[PDB]
Amino acid sequence: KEMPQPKTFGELKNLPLLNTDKPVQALMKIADELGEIFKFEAPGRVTRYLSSQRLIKEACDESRFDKNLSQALKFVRDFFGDGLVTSWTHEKNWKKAHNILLPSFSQQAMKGYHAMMVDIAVQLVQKWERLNADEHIEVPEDMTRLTLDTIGLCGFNYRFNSFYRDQPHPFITSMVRALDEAMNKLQRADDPAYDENKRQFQEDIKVMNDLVDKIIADRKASQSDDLLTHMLNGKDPETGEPLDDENIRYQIITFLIAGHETTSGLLSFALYFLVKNPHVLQKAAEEAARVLVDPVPSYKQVKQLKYVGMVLNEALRLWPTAPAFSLYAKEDTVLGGEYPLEKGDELMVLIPQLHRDKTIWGDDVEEFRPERFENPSAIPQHAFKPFGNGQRACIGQQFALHEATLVLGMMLKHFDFEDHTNYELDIKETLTLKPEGFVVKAKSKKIPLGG
Numbered sequence: 001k002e003m004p005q006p007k008t009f010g011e012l013k014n015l016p017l018l019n020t021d022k023p024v025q026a027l028m029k030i031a032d033e034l035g036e037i038f039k040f041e042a043p044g045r046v047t048r049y050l051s052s053q054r055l056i057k058e059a060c061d062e063s064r065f066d067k068n069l070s071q072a073l074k075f076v077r078d079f080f081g082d083g084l085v086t087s088w089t090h091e092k093n094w095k096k097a098h099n100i101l102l103p104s105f106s107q108q109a110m111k112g113y114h115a116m117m118v119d120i121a122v123q124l125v126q127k128w129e130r131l132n133a134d135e136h137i138e139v140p141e142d143m144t145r146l147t148l149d150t151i152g153l154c155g156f157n158y159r160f161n162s163f164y165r166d167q168p169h170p171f172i173t174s175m176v177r178a179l180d181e182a183m184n185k186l187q188r189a190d191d192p193a194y195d196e197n198k199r200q201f202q203e204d205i206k207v208m209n210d211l212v213d214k215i216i217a218d219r220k221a222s223q224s225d226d227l228l229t230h231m232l233n234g235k236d237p238e239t240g241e242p243l244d245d246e247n248i249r250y251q252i253i254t255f256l257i258a259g260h261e262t263t264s265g266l267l268s269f270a271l272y273f274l275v276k277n278p279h280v281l282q283k284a285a286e287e288a289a290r291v292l293v294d295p296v297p298s299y300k301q302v303k304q305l306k307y308v309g310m311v312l313n314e315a316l317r318l319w320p321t322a323p324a325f326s327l328y329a330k331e332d333t334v335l336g337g338e339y340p341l342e343k344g345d346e347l348m349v350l351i352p353q354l355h356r357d358k359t360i361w362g363d364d365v366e367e368f369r370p371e372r373f374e375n376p377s378a379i380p381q382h383a384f385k386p387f388g389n390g391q392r393a394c395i396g397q398q399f400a401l402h403e404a405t406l407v408l409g410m411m412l413k414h415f416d417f418e419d420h421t422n423y424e425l426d427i428k429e430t431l432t433l434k435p436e437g438f439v440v441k442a443k444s445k446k447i448p449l450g451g
């Protein structure tokens, strides 16, 4: 079969159809018109977007396709190096860090992290219990406070103390401002008009490096067992090698950013869909009230919040917060019996489109219906992939979902929510998705906390 393709405009190819800062959302609308696969060309580059479970399942066969570094990931590699997210599966440093870091997400590790997660969740609830009449909550801003602090604490025994600041931690502002200047620099014709941009970039990189320096120095000057411990002390069983110090610095930055942004998005989306679907908010609050009987939640109690877990999966269905991942053909091959590819050809999984495949989910794909996930073992493999695929799947998946389930649980135990502005979904796309400007009011149910 000839591969569908949007209209090309001479040497600009398909680039005129993607002049937006919401290109995932734009590509979903091209998918709706062209179907399960389309080629997209810009000057310099070609990739093929996949939207069906039929073809994604084939693309997920790791004997034929491996993880690719998309244009975004190649850019980001300048900051994150050969950390876990930005390495090739054929880079020595990928498998080496995988083996050394996997145990930080063992069952005994998750249990270990739970009291630390509770510490941060309790700070969120207290903040909201402390608001005055008529005050409101900036939802993704407060979710980012919680998730940054959680990964700093759990991963690194470092307190960002985000709840003590009315603005973002400088680490976050600096990361974002350095990323933005690196992108902005890419499209500039050394006019000394850019002397301040360059000084600010050097300041921003120094804030990041100073933090990483401190996390490492503080720990060496200190007994712990967390991610940072395995980074510093762990040896790969395959080779006996430890991480080198360059790679360690890349892993710390990698984990501080990856370990919070998508989880903050998920919590923001989940509360959005709850306030827009009040019969579902009622069902999830009934569960939270029935299960979370103690002043603070135990591990076991979080695991019992089944409907809250369904909520979160349904939010990840509709708006997976890392919405695309990329693959390449390891050898010449034919995709779906219909589409010849050459070695090296790039495929992009458009996760939110996959998650709208009506052949799999039925026609109600735009409905927020957590009951979909009642029996998740019956969902076909590769229909639902908010955590990517195979050996390059999310190492943080259980961490993210425990944090989210604990925090959403506690939120729904402690407050009623109001969508006071009748907020209109506006999804901002960066390295992740978030409902920009999402705000609510909370009214305390006056249930006390444990001390």
Ligand code: HEM
Residues within 6 Å of the ligand: 067, 084, 085, 098, 254, 255, 258, 259, 260, 262, 263, 266, 320, 321, 322, 324, 325, 326, 386, 387, 388, 389, 391, 392, 393, 394, 395, 396, 397, 399, 400
């Ligand atoms: C809802 C929250 C999350 C989502 C939706 C998610 C999504 C993903 C996706 C789709 C991938 C595959 C990327 C690719 O194929 O290019 C990935 C990989 C990765 N994730 Fe997450 N993530 C979440 C939370 C976390 C957390 C909490 C951590 C850290 C604790 C984390 C760490 C990582 C790491 C290090 C990798 C690279 C693993 C590898 O290639 O070895 N993620 N994640």
